[PDB]
Amino acid sequence: KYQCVKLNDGHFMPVLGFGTYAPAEVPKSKALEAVKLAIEAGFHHIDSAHVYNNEEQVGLAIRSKIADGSVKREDIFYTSKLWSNSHRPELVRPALERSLKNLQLDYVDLYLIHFPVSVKPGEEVIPKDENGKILFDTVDLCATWEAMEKCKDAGLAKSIGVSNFNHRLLEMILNKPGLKYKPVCNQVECHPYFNQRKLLDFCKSKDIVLVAYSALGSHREEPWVDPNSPVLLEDPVLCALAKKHKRTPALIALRYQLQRGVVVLAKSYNEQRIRQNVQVFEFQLTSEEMKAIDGLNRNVRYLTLDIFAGPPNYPF
């Protein structure tokens, strides 16, 4: 057994997920080893994406742990994400199918619209013209969503949701004429320096689960994250709580999200830290402790993805 939350489509999501994105100079071979270790350690939820260029490796890890008897498919919750070169409705299903072919899995547990800004179709994930300008596309995300809905009806994705959607964009889905399935989740950046209280409350009001990414304060990889940004795990309140509980500031940050009703992801490729992260289920924080962490909030967004800024659907 393991701790899960019931989603608004009746499916269940394990409340601690393993993040698999790593910076491009980390060999992709490391994702295979990391995901096996995560499963060994007790992660039952794995988070990936077409754009991470690791599905072949993450799929092999998963297949390997099923084929060797360590786990059944039904006790792995695997997430993929639809990349912005395949937002046009007729391209959605084929993108899910290529992900599944690369994974050698029959279905994904969850399939997300990765990012609301669309780019031109084709093999290149960031297509650019000869002058280096990103080739943006104009796509109605309500039509993208209908195509997602069909992928759920075909059984290829058990559940569907979104990522990096703001209030306006969620409403655009929620208020869609003929809407068949709400998003089960909105995966977004969330941590004690950016606690997303406002959007969290909105999502709760609509029974959408907020899935927190960069919950340990991000990979901090340039140029995507401003190296001047404060180091979350160096926070003195988190480090003092850690010290007090004989845990680590990472565990404190992760426990904070579980108690506030958020599903939390944690990436690590390091064997010790992978094992340590499942200890989030071994301790609890008091109301006073929780309030102290709410106090750390400071409007710090680490991951702007501002290479996609300009178009109206840029969410930040």
Q: What residue ranges bind ligand NAP (CB under 6 A)?
A: 19-21, 47, 114, 163-164, 187, 213-219, 233, 248, 250, 265-270, 273, 276-277, 303
Q: How many CB atoms lie within 10 A of CB 248?
A: 20
H/E stretch holding 157: strand 157-163
Q: Quick one: 87 or 114, whose CB is closer to ligand SUZ?
A: 114
Q: Taking a C-beta distance cutoff of 8 angstroms, is the pair 276, 250 a contact?
A: yes
Q: Quick one: 158 or 214, whose CB is closer to ligand NAP?
A: 214
Residue nearest to ligand NAP (CB): 19
> Does 145 interact with ligand SUZ (rule: CB under 6 A)?
no
> Does 26 interact with ligand SUZ (rule: CB under 6 A)?
no
Interface with ligand SUZ (CB under 6 A), residue from 49, 110, 185, 262: 49
Q: Quick one: 38 or 147, whose CB is closer to ligand NAP?
A: 38
User: Residue 270 binds what, of ligand SUZ, ligand NAP, none (CB under 5 to 8 Å, by partner type)?
Assistant: ligand NAP
User: Residue 216 binds what, of ligand SUZ, ligand NAP, none (CB under 5 to 8 Å, by partner type)?
Assistant: ligand NAP
Interface with ligand SUZ (CB under 6 A), residue from 66, 125, 134, 237: 125
d(CA 43, CA 206): 27
Q: Which residues are annotated as a binding site?
A: 17-21, 47, 114, 163-164, 187, 213-219, 224, 267-277
User: Residue 262 binds what, of ligand NAP, ligand SUZ, none (CB under 5 to 8 Å, by partner type)?
Assistant: none
H/E stretch holding 267: strand 263-267
d(CA 30, CA 211): 24
> Does 134 interact with ligand SUZ (rule: CB under 6 A)?
no
Least separation in angstroms between CB 127 and ligand SUZ: 10
Pick from 282, 283, 265: nearest CA to 274: 265
Q: Which residues have CB under 8 Å from 282's CB, separation 6+?
A: none
> Is 2 one of the annotated active-site residues of the chain?
no
Torsion sign, CA atoms 6, 72, 212, 95: negative
d(CA 80, CA 96): 8
User: Residue 107 binds what, of ligand SUZ, ligand NAP, none (CB under 5 to 8 Å, by partner type)?
Assistant: none
- The full 3-state SS of 201-265, as one line of letters, equals HHHHHCCCEEEEECCCCCCCCCCCCCCCCCCHHHCHHHHHHHHHHCCCHHHHHHHHHHHCCCEEE
Least separation in angstroms between CB 178 and ligand NAP: 27
Binding residues for ligand SUZ, rule CB under 6 A, total: 10
Q: Which residues have CB under 8 Å from 37's CB, separation 6+?
A: 271, 274, 275
> Does 115 interact with ligand SUZ (rule: CB under 6 A)?
yes
> Using CB under 6 A as the criterion, which residues of the chain lie in contact with ligand SUZ when the complex forms?
21, 49, 51, 114-115, 125-126, 221, 224, 305
Just list the catalytic residues. Answer: 52
